[PDB]
Structure formats: structure tokens, C-alpha cells
Ligand binder design. Sequence first.
Ligand code: HEM
Ligand code: HEM
Ligand code: NA
Ligand code: NA
Ligand SMILES: [O]
Ligand SMILES: [O]
Lengths: 713, 713
Amino acid sequence: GTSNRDWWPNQLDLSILHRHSSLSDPMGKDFNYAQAFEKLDLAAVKRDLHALMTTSQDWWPADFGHYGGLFIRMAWHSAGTYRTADGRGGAGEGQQRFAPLNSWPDNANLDKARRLLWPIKQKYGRAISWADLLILTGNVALESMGFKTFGFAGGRADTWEPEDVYWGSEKIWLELSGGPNSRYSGDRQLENPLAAVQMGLIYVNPEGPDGNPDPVAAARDIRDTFARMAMNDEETVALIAGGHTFGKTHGAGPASNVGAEPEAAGIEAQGLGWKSAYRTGKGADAITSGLEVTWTTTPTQWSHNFFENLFGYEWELTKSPAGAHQWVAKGADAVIPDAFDPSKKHRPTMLTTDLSLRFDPAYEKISRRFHENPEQFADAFARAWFKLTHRDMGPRARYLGPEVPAEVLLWQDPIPAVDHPLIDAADAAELKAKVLASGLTVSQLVSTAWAAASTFRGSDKRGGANGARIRLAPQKDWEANQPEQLAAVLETLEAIRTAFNGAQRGGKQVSLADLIVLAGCAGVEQAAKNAGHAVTVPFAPGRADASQEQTDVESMAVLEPVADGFRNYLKGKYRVPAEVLLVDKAQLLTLSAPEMTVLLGGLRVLGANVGQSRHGVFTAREQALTNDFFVNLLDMGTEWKPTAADADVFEGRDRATGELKWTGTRVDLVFGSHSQLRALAEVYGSADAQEKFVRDFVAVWNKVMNLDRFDLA
Amino acid sequence: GTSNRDWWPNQLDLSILHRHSSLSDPMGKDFNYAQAFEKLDLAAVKRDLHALMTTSQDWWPADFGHYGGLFIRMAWHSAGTYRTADGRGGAGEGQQRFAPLNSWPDNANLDKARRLLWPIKQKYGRAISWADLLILTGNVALESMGFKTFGFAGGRADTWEPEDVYWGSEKIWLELSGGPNSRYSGDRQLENPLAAVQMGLIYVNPEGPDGNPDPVAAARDIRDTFARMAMNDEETVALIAGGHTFGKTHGAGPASNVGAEPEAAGIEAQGLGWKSAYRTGKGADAITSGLEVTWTTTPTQWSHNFFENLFGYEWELTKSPAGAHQWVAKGADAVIPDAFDPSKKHRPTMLTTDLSLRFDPAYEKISRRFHENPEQFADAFARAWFKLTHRDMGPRARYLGPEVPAEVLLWQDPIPAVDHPLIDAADAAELKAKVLASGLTVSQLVSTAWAAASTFRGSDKRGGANGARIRLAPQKDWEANQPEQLAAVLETLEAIRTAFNGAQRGGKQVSLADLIVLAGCAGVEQAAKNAGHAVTVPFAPGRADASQEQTDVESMAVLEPVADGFRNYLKGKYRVPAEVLLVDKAQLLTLSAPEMTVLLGGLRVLGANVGQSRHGVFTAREQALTNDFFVNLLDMGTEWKPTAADADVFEGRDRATGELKWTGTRVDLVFGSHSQLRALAEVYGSADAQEKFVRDFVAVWNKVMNLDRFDLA
Ligand code: HEM
Ligand code: HEM
Ligand code: NA
Ligand code: NA
Ligand SMILES: [O]
Ligand SMILES: [O]
């Protein structure tokens, strides 16, 4: 059947904003996963998982009688899709069970791992999500084999359809770099937001870059991809050596024996894939990656044998039975156990990417230190495993259960506890009036609050106005935040705050994070008043102010907006049209198309544009909250044309006189062009819509202000 | 960006079930269009529409100073996508304003018509939908030009995204038949459910079949397509001749002058398309279809000139200025007015498809009768225009406003008014006990009520249990309804009914339509009791029984299910896989994926399969309402394979012994295979889910029983 996407493959796709509807969710609209999880007997689930580890099923027999290595890989892949550039991917939504991830070649045979967990899932039901269970099972695997984990938090709610993620443009699984849709350009520069070297890989190619088995070159790819998954050199070494202390790879015969991935398999496979014609097709004959490596002499026990082997031998390039490049220890004895036959032993083996840990000079130093001090290795691996598996969970307030680590980690963007009484509704009114009396304008107040709250992204639940990090490096200096303007507003607000807090009794005080939000609320109320409408904008206190010392400046860099349609802002010239980037930002903010539309139209007439640009400011009463953007956009008395100087900027002229009325960007005009957006704009531009426009704007403003408020969840 | 659809183009698309979510809708979830419409000043809207007729805008000047013809085509095209096969298309959701229909070639320049209506739409706001306004505008155009319409009902709610409709598989706009994705095969057989001869056309090619200008062959295409839009020969002749009494076609220069359709145009076009480089690009120079024909000597007034010209001249094949085939009156004088220049006149002209009305022998007789008896022509056209434009609105109960015709028409599948007291809750309890005491089984009761209620489709709101048409021709003889078994059940129910009604006072009685549904409710209650659960199933009385003479048997044929996954039924072997047909059926029933899942799993264990097939009956306690379907489907102790005798039937065998445990179809197993459906099945197959399964089943059962109950809306 030919679809709109086929006919108009470059029109904008709004369906990404309408996922996660209550229609697709089988739980009641009242279901609260956190409440279900808080009643789970987590100890009982772990005891069941522990027993599973050594209870082999004949449809996928356990290597060495222990599934631990398989489940560690499963949990690591569940997490290992994460990209810091947009916060997409990660373990937090259990997306490994859906397309495309369930059928990525790097996820081959993890369908079996997930199926092994069905009986436990079935037992505990809605009290443990698949997303939590995946991670939990990796923890229990590690515990069962003698490794002390750093802790575990539940609270990843299950999702019910695939997330819309850009995974790259290649039309061929695992395509080598340099094709017509190459994700690389220049000197092996990986395109943002990607974090893997080939379509369908988690990070890197275990044979080496584009298959070339050079551990030094491979180390470059490791370092770049891991950095794009928020991991530094020490964390990267600890993760790879830690993981590869367990289990084995599977490459017992030629890859041409392996059939269709799960999404392409026949219905009778019941969601499983990669059925293999090679001998029994499983167990001793398994083929997964094609490589056939077992790293340590005790694959079912934590040890420091990975580094003893890496540094204790020299390595020879060889081929697996499927033809994949891999390395064997020169002159070694057969000291590694076989996974099924107690009478057979094998020489130590390694992947090209394992050897990177020795042959890259900066990794070598860390690997040596971990080899000489295995307790340092164990602690680094525990911390990194925690980080990896929790990186997209959001604020610590979302962490559930009895195993949450008490240590506050800098990577969590921590928010201090509030230890004083909060402002009440009368105090909020007094502060709104003091803010308005200071002479801060609607434009300044709205722009400042927008800048602080709009860093939130629902992908990894980082950002938001909680913390007041807008006053800190690096947010205070982002160009989108207008650093000089911002500084003058913050200075005025900080004086109001000091005066209010100094006049209190009882220990009551207001955070600057709260005041910034409240002040933006006053700005929206005043704008409504300027239009003749009396509204109260909701406000919930309880944010706290984080310090510079509790803020990782480098980690914060990925939250910088380089494109923010809501402020008509674009930091440079990009390959992706600006309207596409608007919808991308709307999705990260968790907005629907109607919400996006209302919010944009309002922000335009409130003076939220960076630099005071007049683009899209289609009103003669700026700083009044009206539906003028829509009424003027939709007026067929104006004709629009792109400018000579800039094809991305348009002039609206009176059709009859030729007089210049307005200018706008693609971001503005899309609302008059795209057939679904223009239908939304028509609702808000109708004669009966001014009260609705104000109400719906106040509601979406409040939603944005509260995106990070999981303390009130 | 490579997507799941790109990698796995034949996996099933469930997003079709999650359209129309409140996410995409800018109105509140409380908005009720009927209530808004009931307050509209319809008379005021019409007076604005009358004024618009002759208010020419320079950007698309009105032919003859009057936009009536353009708006008549606009309304006709809005209605003219309707297919009786699935009830999809039609004017009832205003989908002409969205992709792909807004950009179909046959809708060229109707973007101008719709934009001329924006100021009216803006003025009245939510109180008149675009869907209603399109049709109203065509009515006002006809009235303005002298033709009295039969009536008008409001109540078409606007929609906010494109409908998922199969419009054919061709990848080229307007591709001629016989290509790699031909919609024709055999002796000019058009594939179901399609109702147009080429991709992007409303019905037929105005030059003739595949462009060949043979009016007799064209007539065959006219008759087949119009039949597939619910129109017989008399209605077809009346519509074509009635429509082409007005206005003109547009073909002033070569088609190569015409630019991108709206969905491909630049953002500056602000939703419009087909910008033309030919001279002024508009008015006297307009190019729409490429034909250049004006049918009557008074194109802005109702007349009897269409048939005077059709019969009064002989016709010669010629070409338009764009090179399109059309016909000119041999030896005629220049009697037709020009649209713009009072000093020019033209010879009468006709399309190939116009001449079909004379050269097809059956149309000739109708056309002659209409020529000789123009009052008959007028009344037929008024009735047919009403039908065309309201065909998809559903029962009469949905018709709003002061212009609804009082005459009840056969095509509306009318339901008699209820004129007696309805049964109350005590009476319902008494009838359910009598039903259960009769000896009717859970299987019979459930299967019968399912058969009655599940004929509903939300596409055109035909079907459902209202009317008791299951006891009439042709429903009582459909294979899917198990005619013999059905007859036995109905005989028992009719006896119950007779006895209950004979015992009443005060004129109370129960319809058989109600009793069918109520008896199905009793069967569901009984099934829950068989499983140990105490469940009351909601029931709403008020259905009435329609007569045979109120049931057009040929019109009812298109509701016959040839595939109904919910009864594991397929009438033959089809090119579309059965699981695709299930989701299609779920969409017509208005079900979400979780609803579809729960419903199907319950029906299987209640004995709703046609022929008492064991396919998918994964329980040892049939006729008990349990979640056994899910628990057994998801059991990894069973391995499934297709049978030797039939690749569409699967055997599930114990993995350890090889013993046969179950059989299933593709419809059954998809719930175990599709990664989103299996995630749903997992929720209902969990240990905590038995009570939820029962409750969610009763809710969806009730939903289906009430799909046609617009009397209670
Ligand atoms: C450069 C990064 C990495 C590369 C290229 C890589 C590559 C691979 C490959 C190719 C396999 C074999 C799959 C098969 O045939 O079954 C595998 C296995 C494994 N990986 Fe990694 N890996 C990397 C990092 C990680 C990390 C960070 C972890 C966990 C912390 C991990 C844990 C494991 C485990 C436990 C297995 C064994 C699975 C089994 O016993 O079934 N790896 N790895
Ligand atoms: C065999 C069926 C039909 C064919 C092939 C057909 C074809 C066409 C074409 C090709 C045009 C010219 C488009 C343009 O260049 O502007 C047109 C115009 C029109 N048709 Fe039809 N038509 C059909 C049936 C109908 C019916 C059922 C109605 C209404 C009841 C209708 C009413 C109109 C009117 C009013 C116009 C004039 C538009 C104007 O003045 O701008 N037609 N038709
Ligand atoms: Na994420
Ligand atoms: Na329809
Ligand atoms: O891995
Ligand atoms: O038409």
C-alpha cells in the first residue's frame, strides 16, 4: 500500500509526537508503576533469578551450565544504545524487546536471553517491568558469580511501542563506512547524534574498524563511541575488561547457517530469530557474532584473569570457524574450559577490541593499574556498571527500592534536599508582584524561565529548571541564553530573593530555582493581563539550588541548545531543516503537536526570541498574550517569499500593495504550510479561540516548568 | 533516517489502531462537536456562503464571476472517495484537507476552493467543522445557482491527521493499468477494496479508460466505480449530468506549466499547490485537469441544457490546448459563454465520460427519460446528491440541524422508532435467566451476539446489532454466521421474546435486537461463573427491529465478512495475510490494540470460532472466561511449525516429547510473534492478570455491543 511517507519522503513527521497514547497501553490510565514496584518483593525476584542462572533449558543450553555471561551481555546491550547527544537509547524504556533493537545483529540471540526470563516476568507481573528486569538480571548474574554490585534502582516503566530514534541512514545492516549513506566524514568524524560505528552495532566492530583487525585503530573507535555514551577512559576499560571476564562469544560454524532476525522470521518462531542450520543450532554449536573466544579460565566466576591473560601472553591473529578475525595466545597451553565437554580445553583468545586495552597507550596505563590492583578494577567496574545501567533514569527522586546506592554521584546532576518550609500561595503572590514591580519585562521573565526549564529532555530525563543551573557554568554562557541579558535578570531576581528570605521567620525561604520559575509565571500572568485576561498561572515550589561543585560542566555541554525553534534560534547552518529540528525539540520536551503549536505561537508574541528577532513576531502588541501569531500567519492577504540574502528567511507582503508586513523563518511558516500543523493553527486562529488559546498556553507553559519535578510524581 | 517499515516492510502496522488519540486533537477531551453545531447559526453561515459565491479573489478569480461550479466539484470530490467495500473515504471526516487527498491530481486547485472558505471557517470556529462546511458549501452553490437541494445534515466531526486507507499499490501518480502494481487483472477486474481506476483519481479517467477515448468502454468503468461508491445507473446519470450542468473544466495550456502539488510545494506556498507558469497562471489561463470543456450555455444557472446538447449534436474527437482528448459539437455555432471575456463564445464540448451517458445503451435510456422529463432529472439529482454527501454519516440519529429531510430513505438502513416502554433491570435479569434455562450454550449465545454486533464499521458507521438484521436476508445466510446454528438460536430467542412480551402490561416489550445482545451478555456472565468469577455484564436496551423491506439486501452484501479473525474465519485464500485482515477488522470496529488482544483471547475460549474449529482454542475449559489463551500461547514448552497440508495452519508440540498440544492459524500465532502484540499478550498472560483480563473483556464486549448506539450518544 503506497503511503504519505512514500509520496512526500521529506515532509515532516508528526507521529513521533503522538506515541505513548493511553490507547496503546494495556494498563489502566490509573496504573502507577512506581507504586506497583514499591510493593514487589525484590528479594524473592532475585532468588528466582539466582536459580535461573544454573537451570539450563534444552532449547538454548547454558554455556558452562551458567547463563550469567549471556544475561550480562543482555543488560549491557539494553543500556549500550544510549547516546549523550540526545539522550535517546538506553535501558530505561526496555526498548530491546521492540523493533528495531530486538533484531539488530549485535543483539543476536538476546531474544533467547529475554525468553528465558518470561517465567519470572509472568510470575511477578506488572510489579516488575521488563525494563527493570533486564537490568536486575544482569545484576543478579554478576552477584551470583562473585561480583559485588554498586546497587540497583527500579522505576523504569515499560513502554508499548518502538521509540522513534534516528539510528543512521544506511539501508544495509552493518554497512562499512564510506557508502552513499556514510555516517563518517572528514578524518573518521562520526555524525551526531550517532554513537556507533555501523548500523546495527552497539558501539564498535569487534574485528576492528570496518573489519580491519588493528587494535590501535580500534581503540580510537572505542574511545569516541564510549565518550558519546558518557564514559571516559577509566570507565571504558573497566566496563570492557569487567564484562569480558565472563562467558564467551559464539562462532562455531559459518554464518551462512544463521537465518532471519526476529522481525523477519516466520510467525512460527514466536518472536525468536537467528535460527541456525549448523549442527544442533545451539549450545556447543551456537553461532551469534561469528567469533569464537572465551577470555578467562573461570568464565562463570569473577576473577582478575582477563588482565592476567591480556598482559601474560603475546597474541596471534587467527580466524574463528565462521571466518571472523580474532586473536589466540602464542605458545599457550589449553587452560580455558570448554562450555559443554569436560574433557576439552582451549588456548586463551581475545578480540581485537580487547587488545585495544593493551595497545592503546592511554588504556594500557589504566589496564596495568587494574591488573596490579584488582580491587581498584572491581570498584571502577561496579561504579561504571551502575552508571551505564542507570544513566537515563533521570533524577534520583525516580529511583525505587531497597538497593539504591546512598552515594550521590556527580553524573546524576544532583539537587540538594530541601530542609526548610516552602513558600505558600500567598507568598507566591507577593513574590510575583515584587518581580513585576522591579521593572523586569514580560519578555525578560518569559525568556529566562524558558531558558531554564527547556533544557529538559524526556529521552534521559536530564535538564529542567530544578537546580538553578542556569546561573552556573556552562548554562549561563550559552549563546541561546543571552548571557548578558540573563545575568542582569538573575541579579535582579537574586536581590528580590535575598529581601524575601531575610524577612521570613520559621526558616521559610525560596530557592532561586523556584523564583526563576515563579517569575516566568508572573510574566505570563502579566502578558495575559496586558491582553485583558486575568489568569492565575499554576506554580509548584520545591526546587533547590545546586552548586557549581555539584555540576559537571563537560557533561552539561550536551544539553546546550543549538536549535530551539521556540526562541527562533539556530546556532549554525545544519543539514537538517529547521522545522525538523523543531519537532525533534518538541519530542524531547514531551509535547504533542497541539502543545507545540500553542506554545510556539505564544512565545513569539511574548518576546521569547533570541536577540529580540522580529521573525515570527506577528503582532502589534508584543508582550500581550494573544492568538495574533495564528490570525496573522493565516491571513491570505499576505504573500510570502524567500529573501535574496537568505532562502531560510521569508518576507510577508500585503498582496494588494506590496507593503512589507512581517518576516519569518521556516520554523514560523511551517505552521502555515504543513497540512496537519496548519489545521492546528486554524483552531487557534479562529474567532472563538482567544480564551482557549490563553488557557491552553498556560497549561503547556506549566507542563514545561514541571517536566523535571519527579519529587512531586 | 532508516525506519522499521524500511527494514521489515511486511511486518504488521498497529499504528492504524492508535489514530484519533486525544494527543493529536487540539480540542479538549470534553469537546462535543454535536453540541457545538447545535448552537451554530446555520442561516448566518449560509448567508455568508451565498455572498462568497460572487466575491472573486484575485489570487484565483471566479469563472463567470461565480465560484459555484468550483465548490460543487469540491463537495463532490470530498464525498467521492467513498468505497462501499470498507466504508473508507467519503466526506464525513473532512480528509480532503489532509495528505494524500489534498494533493491528488484529481483534487488539483481544490486547495484554492478550501482556502476561499477559510474566512467563514475562521468566523464560526469550532461550531462548524471543515467536514460539514465542505458539503454545506456545495449545497449553497447549487441553491445559489437555482437548484433546490433535498436537505443537509450537520455532524461530521473534524479529524486531525490522515486516515490510514489503502488507495492502491502503484508508486506513480495516475499510472495506467497493467504496471507492476496493477489494480486491474483479468477482464478489467478492479481489485477490492478500490473504487477508482487509477491512483489519484476519484472514479474514472475523463479521457477514457487508460486514456483511450471510447465512450462505451468508459461507461463500463463508470458503472463499476460508481457501483463501488453505492450508486446505481439512475443515480450515476443523475449525478454526472447534474454536476456537469454547471461550471467548466480548465486546460488553457500545456500541463508542463503546472508545478508541485501541495504536499511537495515550498513552504512559502502556505499550503497551496499547482502553481502554473502559463500566462497569469489562473482565471482565463487556469490549468487543472488539462481538459477545456464548458457544458452549457448558462454555466452559473441550473438548466436542462446538458441533455439538450448531449442529444442535440453529433460529436467529434478533438484535443484541448493541453493535448487532452475531448469532444466538440459538429457544426454548432459558438453559443457557450466564455468565463472571462464577454466578446468570446465557444462551441459546445463534452468529455468522453459525458458521452458515455448517450452511448452506453442502459445509460442512454435514462438520459433520454431525463431529457424528456426534466422534473424527474431534478428530483433524482437532488436525492442522489443528498445520498452521495451523507452516505458515510451513519444512522439518522447522528444527523444534526434544521435541514434534515424528514423522509426516511432505504439506503440509510433505517431503524424504526421505539414507541413503547423499555425493559428495566429487573426485566433484564428475568430474560437472562430464561435464556440460560433454555439450554442455549455459552458458545451459541456469545457467537450469535458477536455475529450481530460485529457488522459495525466506523468508517461509514453502517452495521451493528441495532435492527436485528441478523435474522433477515442476507445476514442470516452468511457463512460466517453459521446459518443453521444461527437459525436454532434465533428460534429459541424468538420463543422467549414472545412469551415475555405476551405476559406484559402497559405496552412494554423487548425487541429481538435487544434480546440477541442481552442473551450474549448472559452467555458472558455464565462463562465468567464457569471460571469462578461473579461478573455482571452491562446492557443498554433500546434497539428496535427493522423489517425485511427496510433492509436493502444488495447494499447489505458489502458488510459480509470474508475475514473475521475474531471467529478465526476466512472465506477463501487471499493475497493479504490473515493477520493484516485482523487488524483491518479491528480498525473498523474502532478497537485499540489492547482491546483487539483481550477480545480475541476471550472469544477463543468462549467457543466463538466458526465451525467450532479448535484453532487457537488454547484451553481445557472451553466456555469458561479465563486468560488461558495467553498463558498457553506464551508457553515456551511448546514449539510451533506450519503443517505440510497447509502453511497457514500451525501445530504446537511439546518441546520435550513431541506430542501435539494445539493447532492455530496465523491470526492466533501473531499474538506470539509480533513484538508489540506479544508485549500485550504477556500482560494478560501474567499471574496477576486473571481478574484484569475478565474485566477488560467485559468492557470491550460491551463496547462492541454498543458501537451503533447513536440513540444514546
Ligand atoms: C568494545 C566494546 C565491546 C565489544 C566490541 C564487545 C564485543 C562482544 C562480542 C562480539 C561478543 C560475542 C557475542 C556472541 O557471539 O555471543 C561479546 C560478548 C560479551 N560481552 Fe562484550 N563487547 C564489548 C563490551 C562489553 C561490555 C562493556 C560488557 C559488559 C560490561 C560486555 C559483556 C560481554 C559478555 C558478558 C559477553 C559474553 C556473552 C555470553 O557469555 O553469552 N561487553 N562481546
Ligand atoms: C464520470 C464521472 C466524472 C468525471 C470523469 C468528471 C470529470 C471532471 C473534470 C475532468 C472536471 C474538470 C476539472 C477541471 O479541469 O477544473 C470536472 C468538473 C466538474 N465536475 Fe465532474 N466528473 C465526473 C462527475 C461529476 C459529478 C458526479 C459531479 C457532481 C455532482 C461533478 C461536478 C463537476 C463540476 C461542478 C465541475 C466544474 C468545476 C468548475 O466549474 O470549476 N462531476 N469534472
Ligand atoms: Na533514552
Ligand atoms: Na468513511
Ligand atoms: O558485548
Ligand atoms: O468532477
